[PDB]
Amino acid sequence: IIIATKNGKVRGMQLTVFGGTVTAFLGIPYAQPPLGRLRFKKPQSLTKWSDIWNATKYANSCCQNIDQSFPGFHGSEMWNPNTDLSEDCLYLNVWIPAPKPKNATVLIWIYGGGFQTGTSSLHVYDGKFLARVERVIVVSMNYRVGALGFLALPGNPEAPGNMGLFDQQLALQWVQKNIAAFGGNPKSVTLFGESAGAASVSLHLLSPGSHSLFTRAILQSGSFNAPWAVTSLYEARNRTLNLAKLTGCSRENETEIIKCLRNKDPQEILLNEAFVVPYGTPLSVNFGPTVDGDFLTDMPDILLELGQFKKTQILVGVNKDEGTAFLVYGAPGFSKDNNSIITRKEFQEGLKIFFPGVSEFGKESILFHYTDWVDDQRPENYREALGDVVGDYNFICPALEFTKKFSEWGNNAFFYYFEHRSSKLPWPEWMGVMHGYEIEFVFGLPLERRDQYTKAEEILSRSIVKRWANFAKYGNPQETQNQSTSWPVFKSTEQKYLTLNTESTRIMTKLRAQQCRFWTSFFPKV
């Protein structure tokens, strides 16, 4: 099976899936390798080739620091890259149904990982099940992360910022110019992503250069207005200069800093990224999106507030326990290996870990709003409060606020609350419905009966997959055949959302109302 693309022919491979076939094209390049003088620059267009490019294996993942906090543990290592790290990493994957479709809707996955980690080749991002079950085409790409993807000297084309977001965009461009040759409809393209991938999706809704490259958007546990998602121009320069100091690249001609940073090995850049700030937290994003004047024309909170974004349907949601995953990367008293019951003093110490540059008053106000107990003698009170602090501040309330503000300009929005803990979840039970552990349900992994998921999980995934596909194809995330709960539109007044679980799919209103009034309306003042 050979497909003629605009840059040359590519050969794929056949896959057996659920008694059927899916054609996979793993590792198609979509840009010149950003090497040498191209390091830190926007991705450059790809020159034609005259042979057959062999798209039969995942390509290199982009350079990044690896999680080494729990070596050997599947709960952390399932997120580490599973192909070679290299600056030569601008490749993408395509799964197409067999027989080749006629005008298939296209799903484009953008992975998360805090803009500093991630890769399209992870097992939980394998698009072959969606192509098999729903006959959509699934595209995913690698994009640069960390300083190599987001180092910013505003205005300087040698390091303009947002390079990794331009990587994503050049790949959406690739789908526009090429996907019809695979049987895809370039006019029916839905971006979806999780965590920083969702923040990326939300930023593509804002970027005028992305508006004609997709139709609809899905945002899983992430949005650009989350406190970790956008770096200010002030911090970005301070961090670029700090990186230069730590590498001996300090100059005065700012372009000379970049040239010096271009001769450093990826490792030396990587090992210094952590220290460009004085106080880090487990949620630090030292090198991420900025207002560059190119991808992002203004501070995105202003664009959202004033209606300057692509008018289309969105599907947004969050998981019950977004925050807990980050407590074992720093908060005192927490461990994946015990029940992590903490004291009031440990909670207080945890606030200092997560809100280091916040006034004593600000930190008191968090404690005040999250420690008025329904039972002062319940021992896990402080353990659960800190998880809720971190998840509400960093994920849930920004997603809800994004959805409110987006829906106020007339478009249909749909909001979900994912609350099923995977039966295979390797992390301990006190961490609950963790950040990122809906992804396998979205990609349909529980549909493989060989994988030790329960039967209730197979059916939950099956319904989620149908709802996602119906959203991509038709703008409406319903499951219309198996007498399902109808998913109502999220409006700013009633704020209805759908809960996703194995037991009862219910309609609820005003998720985390009191908590989010604190984070969205009071805490930005402190």
Ligand SMILES: *[C@@H]1O[C@H](CO[C@@H]2O[C@@H](C)[C@@H](O)[C@@H](O)[C@@H]2O)[C@@H](O[C@@H]2O[C@H](CO)[C@@H](O)[C@H](O)[C@H]2NC(C)=O)[C@H](O)[C@H]1NC(C)=O
């Ligand atoms: C790209 O692939 C072609 C086709 O071979 C395919 O890939 C192999 C890994 C194997 O799985 C085959 O069954 C597939 O059909 C390669 O063509 C081969 O090229 C070598 C050297 O030119 C030649 O000795 C073989 O006879 C060719 N055919 C086969 C069936 O192997 C081609 O070389 C690949 N391009 C590369 C490696 O750059």
Ligand SMILES: *[C@@H]1O[C@H](CO[C@@H]2O[C@@H](C)[C@@H](O)[C@@H](O)[C@@H]2O)[C@@H](O[C@@H]2O[C@H](CO)[C@@H](O)[C@H](O)[C@H]2NC(C)=O)[C@H](O)[C@H]1NC(C)=O
């Ligand atoms: C839960 O564990 C944390 C983490 O401690 C590590 O992991 C444990 C499972 C065990 O193997 C310890 O030996 C490890 O140090 C405990 O936090 C530590 O508690 C000790 C108690 O003396 C203290 O000296 C350390 O400073 C703590 N370290 C950190 C990083 O918090 C915690 O006490 C355990 N709690 C419960 C309820 O089991």
Ligand SMILES: *[C@@H](O)c1ccc2cccc(OCCCN3CCN(CC#C)CC3)c2n1
């Ligand atoms: C998701 O993209 C996201 C959002 C914010 C943020 C901030 C800092 C660091 C981040 O990623 C760190 C990667 C570690 N992460 C890997 C997965 N682990 C288990 C789970 C789920 C927990 C931590 C970051 N990422």
Ligand SMILES: *[C@@H]1O[C@H](CO[C@@H]2O[C@@H](C)[C@@H](O)[C@@H](O)[C@@H]2O)[C@@H](O)[C@H](O)[C@H]1NC(C)=O
């Ligand atoms: C493919 O379809 C085009 C129509 O575009 C799409 O219709 C639905 C699927 C929406 O999701 C939205 O993307 C568009 O309205 C046709 O114009 C085109 O000719 C068709 N091409 C082929 C080869 O079938």
Ligand SMILES: *[C@@H]1O[C@H](CO[C@@H]2O[C@@H](C)[C@@H](O)[C@@H](O)[C@@H]2O)[C@@H](O)[C@H](O)[C@H]1NC(C)=O
């Ligand atoms: C801006 O940068 C100042 C200088 O950073 C210092 O040197 C670099 C290499 C790192 O090692 C960093 O830890 C040092 O502090 C900071 O002192 C200053 O606090 C920064 N500004 C803000 C608001 O964080």
Ligand SMILES: *[C@@H]1O[C@H](CO[C@@H]2O[C@@H](C)[C@@H](O)[C@@H](O)[C@@H]2O)[C@@H](O)[C@H](O)[C@H]1NC(C)=O
């Ligand atoms: C819908 O359910 C299918 C199997 O369930 C059977 O068929 C439906 C129509 C009802 O009659 C039910 O009582 C039966 O047990 C699944 O094979 C199919 O994947 C499901 N589809 C979705 C989108 O969830």
Ligand SMILES: CC(=O)N[C@H]1[C@H]([C@H](O)[C@H](O)CO)O[C@@](O)(C(=O)O)C[C@@H]1O
């Ligand atoms: C940097 C990198 O990943 N390089 C290459 C790898 C490895 O160098 C070798 O497998 C030995 O490690 O091998 C390939 O050539 C191959 O034939 O699949 C592909 C890839 O370009």
Ligand SMILES: *[C@@H]1O[C@H](CO)[C@@H](O)[C@H](O)[C@H]1NC(C)=O
């Ligand atoms: C910095 O160096 C570049 C490349 O040599 C040059 O074009 C530019 O004019 C220089 N600017 C200053 C202020 O030295």
